[PDB]
Amino acid sequence: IVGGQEAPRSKWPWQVSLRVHGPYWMHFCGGSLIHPQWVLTAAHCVGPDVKDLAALRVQLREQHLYYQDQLLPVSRIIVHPQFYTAQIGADIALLELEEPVKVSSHVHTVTLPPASETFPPGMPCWVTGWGDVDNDERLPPPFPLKQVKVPIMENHICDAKYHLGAYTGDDVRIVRDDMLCAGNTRRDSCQGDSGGPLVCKVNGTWLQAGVVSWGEGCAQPNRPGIYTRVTYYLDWIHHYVPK
Amino acid sequence: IVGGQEAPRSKWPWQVSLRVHGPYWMHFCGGSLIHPQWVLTAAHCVGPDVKDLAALRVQLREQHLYYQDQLLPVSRIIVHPQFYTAQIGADIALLELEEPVKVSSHVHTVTLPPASETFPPGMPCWVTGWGDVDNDERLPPPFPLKQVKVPIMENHICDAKYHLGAYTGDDVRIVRDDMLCAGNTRRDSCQGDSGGPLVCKVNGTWLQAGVVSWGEGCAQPNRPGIYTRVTYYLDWIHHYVPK
Amino acid sequence: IVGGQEAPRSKWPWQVSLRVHGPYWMHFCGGSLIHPQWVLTAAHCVGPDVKDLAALRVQLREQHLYYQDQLLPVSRIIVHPQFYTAQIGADIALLELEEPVKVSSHVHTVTLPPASETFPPGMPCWVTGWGDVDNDERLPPPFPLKQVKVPIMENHICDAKYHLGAYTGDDVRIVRDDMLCAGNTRRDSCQGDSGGPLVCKVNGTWLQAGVVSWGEGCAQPNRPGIYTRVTYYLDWIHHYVPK
Amino acid sequence: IVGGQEAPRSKWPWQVSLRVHGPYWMHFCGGSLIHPQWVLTAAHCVGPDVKDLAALRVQLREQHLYYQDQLLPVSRIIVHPQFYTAQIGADIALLELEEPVKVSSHVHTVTLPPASETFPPGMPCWVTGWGDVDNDERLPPPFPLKQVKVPIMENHICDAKYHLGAYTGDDVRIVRDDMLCAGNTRRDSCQGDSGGPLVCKVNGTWLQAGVVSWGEGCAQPNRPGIYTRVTYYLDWIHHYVPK
Ligand SMILES: CSc1cc(C(=O)N2CCC(c3cccc(CN)c3)CC2)cc([Si](C)(C)O[Si](C)(C)c2cc(SC)cc(C(=O)N3CCC(c4cccc(CN)c4)CC3)c2)c1
Ligand SMILES: CSc1cc(C(=O)N2CCC(c3cccc(CN)c3)CC2)cc([Si](C)(C)O[Si](C)(C)c2cc(SC)cc(C(=O)N3CCC(c4cccc(CN)c4)CC3)c2)c1
Numbered sequence: 001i002v003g004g005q006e007a008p009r010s011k012w013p014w015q016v017s018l019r020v021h022g023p024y025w026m027h028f029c030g031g032s033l034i035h036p037q038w039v040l041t042a043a044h045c046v047g048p049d050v051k052d053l054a055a056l057r058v059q060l061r062e063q064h065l066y067y068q069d070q071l072l073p074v075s076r077i078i079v080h081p082q083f084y085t086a087q088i089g090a091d092i093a094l095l096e097l098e099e100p101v102k103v104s105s106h107v108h109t110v111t112l113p114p115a116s117e118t119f120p121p122g123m124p125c126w127v128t129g130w131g132d133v134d135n136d137e138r139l140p141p142p143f144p145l146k147q148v149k150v151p152i153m154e155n156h157i158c159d160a161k162y163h164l165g166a167y168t169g170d171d172v173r174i175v176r177d178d179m180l181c182a183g184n185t186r187r188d189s190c191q192g193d194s195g196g197p198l199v200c201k202v203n204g205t206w207l208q209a210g211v212v213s214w215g216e217g218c219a220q221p222n223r224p225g226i227y228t229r230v231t232y233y234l235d236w237i238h239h240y241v242p243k
Numbered sequence: 244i245v246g247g248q249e250a251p252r253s254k255w256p257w258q259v260s261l262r263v264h265g266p267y268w269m270h271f272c273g274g275s276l277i278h279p280q281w282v283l284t285a286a287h288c289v290g291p292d293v294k295d296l297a298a299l300r301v302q303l304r305e306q307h308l309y310y311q312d313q314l315l316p317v318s319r320i321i322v323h324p325q326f327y328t329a330q331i332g333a334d335i336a337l338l339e340l341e342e343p344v345k346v347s348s349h350v351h352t353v354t355l356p357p358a359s360e361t362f363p364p365g366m367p368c369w370v371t372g373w374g375d376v377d378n379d380e381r382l383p384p385p386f387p388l389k390q391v392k393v394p395i396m397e398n399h400i401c402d403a404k405y406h407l408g409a410y411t412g413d414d415v416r417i418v419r420d421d422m423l424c425a426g427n428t429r430r431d432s433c434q435g436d437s438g439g440p441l442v443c444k445v446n447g448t449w450l451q452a453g454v455v456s457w458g459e460g461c462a463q464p465n466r467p468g469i470y471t472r473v474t475y476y477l478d479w480i481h482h483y484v485p486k
Numbered sequence: 487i488v489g490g491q492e493a494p495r496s497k498w499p500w501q502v503s504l505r506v507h508g509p510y511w512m513h514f515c516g517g518s519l520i521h522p523q524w525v526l527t528a529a530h531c532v533g534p535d536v537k538d539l540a541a542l543r544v545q546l547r548e549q550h551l552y553y554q555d556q557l558l559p560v561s562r563i564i565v566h567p568q569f570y571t572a573q574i575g576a577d578i579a580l581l582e583l584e585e586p587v588k589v590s591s592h593v594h595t596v597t598l599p600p601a602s603e604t605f606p607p608g609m610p611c612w613v614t615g616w617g618d619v620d621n622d623e624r625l626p627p628p629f630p631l632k633q634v635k636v637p638i639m640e641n642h643i644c645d646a647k648y649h650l651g652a653y654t655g656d657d658v659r660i661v662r663d664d665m666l667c668a669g670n671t672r673r674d675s676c677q678g679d680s681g682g683p684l685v686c687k688v689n690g691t692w693l694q695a696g697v698v699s700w701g702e703g704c705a706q707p708n709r710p711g712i713y714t715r716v717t718y719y720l721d722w723i724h725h726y727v728p729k
Numbered sequence: 730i731v732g733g734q735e736a737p738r739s740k741w742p743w744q745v746s747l748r749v750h751g752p753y754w755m756h757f758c759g760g761s762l763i764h765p766q767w768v769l770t771a772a773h774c775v776g777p778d779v780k781d782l783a784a785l786r787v788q789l790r791e792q793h794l795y796y797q798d799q800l801l802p803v804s805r806i807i808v809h810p811q812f813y814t815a816q817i818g819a820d821i822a823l824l825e826l827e828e829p830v831k832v833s834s835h836v837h838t839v840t841l842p843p844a845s846e847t848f849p850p851g852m853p854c855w856v857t858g859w860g861d862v863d864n865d866e867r868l869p870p871p872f873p874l875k876q877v878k879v880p881i882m883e884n885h886i887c888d889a890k891y892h893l894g895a896y897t898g899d900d901v902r903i904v905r906d907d908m909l910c911a912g913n914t915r916r917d918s919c920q921g922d923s924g925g926p927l928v929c930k931v932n933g934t935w936l937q938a939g940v941v942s943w944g945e946g947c948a949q950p951n952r953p954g955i956y957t958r959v960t961y962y963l964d965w966i967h968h969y970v971p972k
Pocket of ligand 2: 571573674675676677678679680698699700701702703704705710711712814816917918919920921922923941942943944945946947948953954955
């Protein structure tokens with residue numbers, strides 16, 4: 001997370017950390033708990049190549065990475081079948097846990113948006129995670145969960161920005177319709193935040209608008225953060241995740 | 244080049260090395276001389292973001308990088324306006340030299356196929372360059388130009404290979420019609436060979452079939468080298484480059 | 487610590503971590519609390535070149551680095567004036583804290599041997615720290631304090647081992663009289679354990695025999711861990727540190 | 730080499746490159762040819778641990794590293810028996826080739842000094858090699874041999890400089906009598922130059938005064954280059970090398 005601050009303990013009870021087995025169970029991506037037995041993340045975190053489930057664990061909301069881990073194994077990885085890269089799109093995946101988790105005030109699910117929410121500019125939205133705090137700059141020990149409030153920008157404006165300084169033709173769309181843009185040169189998500197939630201407070205309720213997907217670097221001029229737009233994927237999600 | 248050998252000095256007289264200004268004029272990509280004043284390369288070598296022309300140079304056929312350079316300035320970079328990443332396609336670009344080269348025995352142009360050329364599956368073709376000799380293993384000093392023989396394959400087969408051990412749906416296309424595949428777990432192009440030529444000798448004439456574009460790593464199981472298919476962009480190339 | 491395990495929280499109440507200012511207060515060396523206001527460490531951790539006192543802090547006994555630090559400022563660094571490199575010797579230093587620590591169950595001083603103490607060859611001693619778990623392999627998060635049991639050996643034996651597979655003449659001394667050796671190919675101190683304590687329980691009392699100083703790598707054949715011999719510098723230590 | 734320039738072809742016909750076997754025969758140190766079958770280098774290049782001769786080669790004077798190698802194997806490594814580290818001293822070694830080399834105007838031996846030469850300040854002296862051109866900055870391709878003219882400074886002045894900014898006691902000698910000091914903040918030897926020659930022109934004849942040994946970094950204030958003083962080691966050399 002570029003900018004923002006350490007999250008209070010009482011916030012974002014749905015944030016998860018994904019871990020891969022190596023010299024230690026290392027954090028490589030975020031996620032969100034959307035049901036007691038399902039985690040929502042980015043496909044590029046766990047694909048497009050098939051991975052060994054045994055080498056994967058999930059860790060539920062922790063204030064500091066690694067310090068009080070209780071790692072949960074995963075029975076299934078479902079990756080959106082149109083996923084190949086994040087720039088093409090469908091950067092979205094589901095992790096099914098081997099057991100349903102017990103929920104509490106500090107660990108519980110996030111609400112998905114109804115299909116028709118657009119998340120226009122000026123909505124209040126936060127992104128969270130344990131990624132880099134700037135380009136090629138890791139989150140320091142003790143690895144506190146960070147949050148940063150990020151401005152949403154309309155897709156056609158974001159797409160036009162991405163064309164600035166580029167050879168790509170103006171009519172060749174960069175930012176796709178299944179994506180959402182947010183952030184600026186002070187406030188952004190970054191590497192290690194992928195797969196985590198962008199959430200907005202609508203009519204009193206926190207809703208997941210996006211999954212951290214990609215960008216050109218982190219907090220660079222005219223290159224805002226790109227997120228998988230969750231509304232585009234609700235039917236796919238509900239094919240696997242009970243309501 | 245993975246699984247290759249050093250090229251004899253009489254061969255590949257069209258090969259070029261692209262150089263970027265830092266502590267020295269470092270090689271970052273290959274190219275091919277297709278006209279006395281024009282180099283054909285990959286877009287991803289030089290875009291999608293516009294970079295400074297003064298920081299770029301071209302080096303013509305050389306047995307050993309850096310030893311006896313004669314570096315040529317570039318007057319123009321033309322990047323296909325559809326390019327944004329290699330996986331989406333249109334990974335092709337032209338460099339116009341400030342001067343025509345005085346062509347010779349050691350240096351000369353490669354012939355581009357006619358639009359109708361069907362390079363048959365299995366045809367033995369050659370890819371050349373100064374890239375990595377395996378995954379994350381750089382070509383050692385003294386940086387001899389390498390060559391490797393690689394069998395062309397049908398896009399349908401290469402697509403189906405990319406889908407083995409992958410979550411991507413089988414009907415979702417990974418290898419596209421503007422691409423061409425070649426190579427296997429012993430023979431392949433690699434990082435720093437990008438932009439460089441895949442050539443096939445067809446009824447006795449060396450034709451450029453492909454531009455080194457991308458892959459999942461180098462020489463991995465079921466992940467052949469992917470090349471921009473030259474016949475596909477013939478008209479765009481001829482829009483700028485004289486016959 | 488190589489070939490060790492995580493220390494129980496009741497043990498090694500004298501262990502300290504030295505911290506240097508960068509992007510965070512990074513651990514670079516261990517130390518031992520030998521008086522409420524004094525830390526014993528290795529000179530090479532802080533010299534031979536004079537560095538800024540404000541960039542240094544001390545952290546007292548902690549189960550996991552970084553998690554719940556309470557960092558203590560240092561009012562003075564005293565480096566043995568004979569020190570220039572560990573191989574020459576006099577690798578020993580004192581840090582005077584700005585304040586006496588309020589000693590307790592969890593935090594307290596280690597006892598230094600009397601000048602006459604002959605720690606016998608073979609005696610089982612313990613070395614503790616947050617250093618590397620093998621050559622060029624850093625202690626993983628969450629950075630638990632480790633311990634390992636290491637047999638003391640006679641300098642004459644350790645010297646002769648250092649000379650095996652070496653050009654150094656057999657009469658030319660490598661391990662010196664102000665040094666003490668311990669460890670084997672399974673058990674040893676390592677990089678980042680430097681300055682930290684080698685302790686032996688002698689007729690029921692934990693005495694500090696050594697300061698982690700140097701070695702040829704960690705846990706290599708015929709290259710035991712070398713430690714500054716505490717009895718040797720007792721008078722210098724007592725020149726500054728009250729009984 | 731820090732400062733100075735690429736050496737003309739016609740100079741330093743006695744410079745050698747030492748190579749270790751890995752992905753390629755990589756340069757790790759210099760040396761000088763002092764007899765057709767003997768090379769003079771620094772012990773720390775090839776010790777103090779016994780190394781496998783088969784993994785070692787010597788390369789005689791080359792204008793550019795790697796480009797026209799003819800590597801020679803070594804039958805014997807003789808390391809000064811008092812060597813353990815460079816700061817202790819006796820940083821000197823001999824490589825015996827399996828065959829005597831043929832000498833020419835471009836490849837031939839350097840003259841050793843008579844025992845009584847002191848090489849006082851103001852003598853004109855050059856150091857040569859293929860090392861780093863500044864701290865942690867490698868010599869770029871095409872790796873030209875560099876030279877730099879360096880001022881000699883008297884041992885007691887150099888030793889006093891090394892004490893400046895240090896904890897080490899003023900009467901604890903840092904720069905030993907078997908060493909020689911040369912260089913300043915613009916002109917110095919560096920990592921990869923070790924084992925190579927410092928040579929001075931005395932009464933018309935080029936003489937090797939030093940072997941590149943150590944220092945604190947390269948071209949830092951008050952930290953000039955330190956060399957093994959060849960006059961101290963002439964009897965040892967002549968025990969092995971015919972006159
Ligand atoms: C199977 S597709 C694929 C393959 C590879 C791969 O294996 N490669 C590349 C191809 C190479 C090659 C070359 C020549 C020949 C051959 C044939 N054998 C192969 C071998 C090695 C690598 C990638 Si990759 C994931 C490494 O893409 Si890019 C680093 C070039 C990339 C592309 C883009 S598009 C503008 C942005 C960024 C980038 O800036 N990132 C990634 C996203 C990060 C991020 C994360 C989270 C949030 C945000 C928003 N602030 C940003 C920031 C850093 C990075 C993709
Ligand atoms: C002012 S004295 C000095 C200076 C430098 C330094 O600045 N250098 C080296 C010389 C270079 C140079 C070359 C040519 C010319 C010039 C002149 N311009 C300079 C410049 C860079 C470096 C050192 Si240094 C600390 C980097 O010594 Si060594 C890496 C060669 C070394 C020497 C020895 S002696 C056998 C062992 C190890 C080693 O294996 N270690 C260190 C100890 C560690 C350790 C720590 C704790 C416990 C244990 C026990 N298992 C082991 C393990 C790794 C390492 C010391």
